[PDB]
Amino acid sequence: EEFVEEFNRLKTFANFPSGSPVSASTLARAGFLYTGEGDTVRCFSCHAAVDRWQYGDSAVGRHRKESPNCRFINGFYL
Numbered sequence: 069e070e071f072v073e074e075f076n077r078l079k080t081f082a083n084f085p086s087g088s089p090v091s092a093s094t095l096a097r098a099g100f101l102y103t104g105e106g107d108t109v110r111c112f113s114c115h116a117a118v119d120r121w122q123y124g125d126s127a128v129g130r131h132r133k134e135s136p137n138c139r140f141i142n143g144f145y146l
């Protein structure tokens with residue numbers, strides 16, 4: 069696990085495609101790690117995978133959409 073620390077999540081985005089409409093910093097902030105494939109990220113807590121990021125997307129907004137009862141998005145790491 070170890071990924072409760074925000075910098076520890078951002079470390080997983082080594083080869084994340086440079087031209088993405090949502091940045092690696094924002095996705096790490098919204099609880100996601102990188103799977104290493106396409107634009108697919110998975111939550112460290114709830115294990116939900118989200119891909120196909122578009123312009124004007126909320127990282128956090130989509131994470132709550134896929135996982136309304138996620139520990140991280142409901143504040144159980146602050």
Ligand code: NA
Pocket residue numbers: 116117118119134
């Ligand atoms: Na999904």
Ligand SMILES: [Zn+2]
Pocket residue numbers: 099111112113114115116131135138139140141
């Ligand atoms: Zn989650």
